[PDB]
Amino acid sequence: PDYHEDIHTYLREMEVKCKPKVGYMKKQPDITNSMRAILVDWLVEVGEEYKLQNETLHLAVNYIDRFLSSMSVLRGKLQLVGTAAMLLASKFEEIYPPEVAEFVYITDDTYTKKQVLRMEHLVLKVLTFDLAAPTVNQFLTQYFLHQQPANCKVESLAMFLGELSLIDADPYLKYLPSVIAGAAFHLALYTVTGQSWPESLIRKTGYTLESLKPCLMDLHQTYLKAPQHAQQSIREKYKNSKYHGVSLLNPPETLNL
């Protein structure tokens, strides 16, 4: 009942506190957005390799963006930062995480176990143990309850569009998780069933359809050009029958807004 409203209210309040500096990459001397894209895409496959939850993947990216907001990192250490964030996210979300050795092994033994564990220490200190961060995944979950005629294809397509936004920092670091989730839900609902962002959520989130329009335009473009993107791990992920092959769905030509 109401503790669902209090949760949505609390997540909305906490998502503002856990947001990274939007333009931190411009102040990063050695790493670029493309390298970040390569990192998160690699993390998509390690989560797929070790059969980890989608929330674990989302959390790790959040950790990475916040860490890189405060700390300047060279190219050769970027993967180490992402690995520790993945291990920490695994410790938070999974019932039990993969062993540290698995994370050392998955990096092709680029770093040692002690490098991983001390990077974990550093990330924990930099993030000040604030690991329970709200994600697009979490808001999608909250939104889905307002889809009483639940559609697995809509939910799967929304997750797909949500995961794709993790890859590119250039447009999506300036949108809150709740807003990204809003655009992803509408776009999926529109593609699969041809209907729109419902009133119950407009009442719930306060977001009008037009308030989501800027994020919705960006996400629809990511959807359209997803076949041509340099990173393809998520698309391959959502071709499998588990996600009803929603990635193979032809996105609509326009959205009529």
Partner: peptide, 7 residues
């Protein structure tokens, strides 16, 4: 999967 990110 198992690889070293070459950027």
């Amino acid at each position: 999967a198992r690889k070293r990110l070459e950027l």
